[PDB]
Write an enzyme that holds these catalytic residues in place. Structure first.
Site, mmCIF file in Angstrom:
data_model
loop_
_atom_site.group_PDB
_atom_site.id
_atom_site.type_symbol
_atom_site.label_atom_id
_atom_site.label_comp_id
_atom_site.label_asym_id
_atom_site.label_seq_id
_atom_site.Cartn_x
_atom_site.Cartn_y
_atom_site.Cartn_z
ATOM 1 N N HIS A 56 0.829 -1.079 -0.076
ATOM 2 C CA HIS A 56 0.063 -0.056 0.054
ATOM 3 C C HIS A 56 0.836 1.301 -0.013
ATOM 4 C CE1 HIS A 56 0.320 -0.330 4.688
ATOM 5 N NE2 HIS A 56 -0.116 1.335 4.422
ATOM 6 N N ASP A 91 0.528 -8.106 2.251
ATOM 7 C CA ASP A 91 0.822 -6.506 2.223
ATOM 8 C C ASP A 91 2.349 -6.399 2.255
ATOM 9 O OD1 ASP A 91 0.643 -3.771 2.129
ATOM 10 O OD2 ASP A 91 -0.137 -3.506 4.253
ATOM 11 N N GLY A 96 2.162 7.456 9.283
ATOM 12 C CA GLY A 96 3.413 7.703 8.699
ATOM 13 C C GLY A 96 4.417 6.473 9.084
ATOM 14 N N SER A 133 3.604 3.223 8.447
ATOM 15 C CA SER A 133 3.704 2.002 7.798
ATOM 16 C C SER A 133 4.927 1.741 6.928
ATOM 17 C CB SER A 133 2.804 2.659 6.413
ATOM 18 O OG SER A 133 1.372 2.246 6.346
ATOM 19 N N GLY A 134 5.185 0.507 6.532
ATOM 20 C CA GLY A 134 6.185 -0.293 5.717
ATOM 21 C C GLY A 134 7.415 -0.691 6.540
#
Lengths: 240, 61, 61, 240
Positions: D45, D93, D186, D188-189
């Site tokens: 995403h 994801d 902020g 995410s990842g």
């Protein structure tokens, strides 16, 4: 509306404003046309979004209430089944909306007249485009309703190389292309009013322009051809 | 042109279509406004590079 | 929030997820900021109607 | 990161900032982990759309240049083939990113170590989350790198009706949920570093939280399980 003039109050009684709610107000997004007391005709691309919509009938000046308007909600929405968001150039840009209440007809509110099934206009026929869109490429939205004269350009010339080529299909109508007058952002949703035997009827629903700009030489405004979908229109409504 | 825009970009409340060097002139643009932004407009003689910048069409390759 | 927001809405540059009256608490919100907006947040006890306005959760059916 | 502290200057060497071109500047949008000299691990995403991105290694303070950073561009994006944008809850994801050049390894820049294929942690295992995300629900982005202690919640409790229910799958990992500490927009990842037999390894990729808010009791932070995708990883790298 690039290159036209202000319409006289309540002159095109079948034109409507389509808005979505946003913060404290309601924003104008597309136009369309009234065909029954509780049905409206517009473009598919205007309602592919998931928003909260309303319809204004009898409108003129968007910033002041003058007493001729009626506000009504949108209860249901039918998009043509072949519509594909990824390819406007494929055609089928049309939709129908059923209203939450039946509107009151009067001198300021009247139904639009449709063409007989299958009809095709000759080269250079006379028509007009009505709207609240920008009044210049890279401009600002209009305050009061505008109009411009915009004659027909046949399929054979419209779909040739110096024009639009294969982008154009037989389910569409072209008009204009002189480099002076055309459509513009916010005019999406039709109508295109054309004279036949001294009588008017709605022959097109506005659809797209070229990416270089609004008024470009050899790139006329393109509209969905209403006469091509007469059966679908009647059948949808009758079945509901 | 408006505080966060980069060179050749102009902030607008009714966004149109943008074009890269090389797109054909017979690609459509729907007549509905898009979200407010710092637009690179073809109407001003501009084109987008592949790494996202905004240039005058003559400087294309 | 800002001059254009309606009742119970607050202007943010880092937007998150919104809930209608009715949604279940086990629905996901990705950990990334969304575009700036006039937000109705669940974190301040608000929910959206069918019609689109913002109200306190205590008025949901 | 909600409920944590500032990390020591360059103590999490394989952490990166994924930024996007904005106007005159570059804006932070996600975190991710350095896995090779020219490869990085992030979330699907984060890169789902058309954008121009770059990456920064050896960073601490986003607002200034301390002398430790290396700025590089992103040259190729590879996302999981089952990923479906319309459904985070389904899992998958995860994405891989090839860099335009190889970075220089050194004291401030090092590779993340991955876990043995198929490994699963026991309930309550010791782990930390790192990032530049909001420090409070509806708050603002951090200026320096933050960290928080967040132990795991096993599959049996996580998928229970009092927790996440069927929204959680066996391909994910849960951590936190005390209503005090968690990941926030902020983040995410990014990585989740966990200990096993005295050594650190990266066991998750930050995915989602609840719509009710960031730190909520009984709703732990959800991460993609890295150990369920080791061979896909290896393949992708080998053939590109």
């Amino acid at each position: 509306v690039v290159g036209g003039t202000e319409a006289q109050r309540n002159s095109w009684p079948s034109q409507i404003s389509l808005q979505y709610r946003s913060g404290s107000s309601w924003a104008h997004t597309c136009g369309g046309t009234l065909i029954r007391q509780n049905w409206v005709m517009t473009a598919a691309h205007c309602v592919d979004r998931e928003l909260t919509f309303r319809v204004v009938v009898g409108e003129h000046n968007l910033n002041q209430n003058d007493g001729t308007e009626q506000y009504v909600g949108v209860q249901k929405i039918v998009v043509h089944p072949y519509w594909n968001t990824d390819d406007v150039a494929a055609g089928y840009d049309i939709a129908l909306l059923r209203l939450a209440q039946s509107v009151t007809l009067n001198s300021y509110v009247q139904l639009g007249v449709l063409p007989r099934a299958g009809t095709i206009l000759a080269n250079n026929s006379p028509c007009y485009i009505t709207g609240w869109g920008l009044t210049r490429t890279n401009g600002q939205l209009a305050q009061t309703l505008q109009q411009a004269y915009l004659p027909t350009v046949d399929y054979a010339i419209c779909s040739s190389s110096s024009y639009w080529g294969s982008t154009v299909k037989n389910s569409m109508v072209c008009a204009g292309g002189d480099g002076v007058r055309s459509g513009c952002q916010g005019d999406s949703g039709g109508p295109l009013h054309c004279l036949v035997n001294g009588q008017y009827a709605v022959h097109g629903v506005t659809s797209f322009v070229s990416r270089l700009g609004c008024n470009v030489t050899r790139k006329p405004t393109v509209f969905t051809r209403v006469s091509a979908y007469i059966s679908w229109i009647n059948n949808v409504i009758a079945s509901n | 042109g408006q505080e966060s825009c980069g060179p050749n970009e102009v902030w607008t409340e009714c966004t149109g279509c943008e074009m890269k060097c090389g797109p054909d002139e017979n690609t459509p643009c729907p007549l509905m406004c898009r979200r407010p932004s710092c637009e690179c407009s073809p109407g001003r003689g501009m084109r987008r590079t592949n790494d996202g910048k905004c240039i005058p069409a003559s400087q294309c390759p």
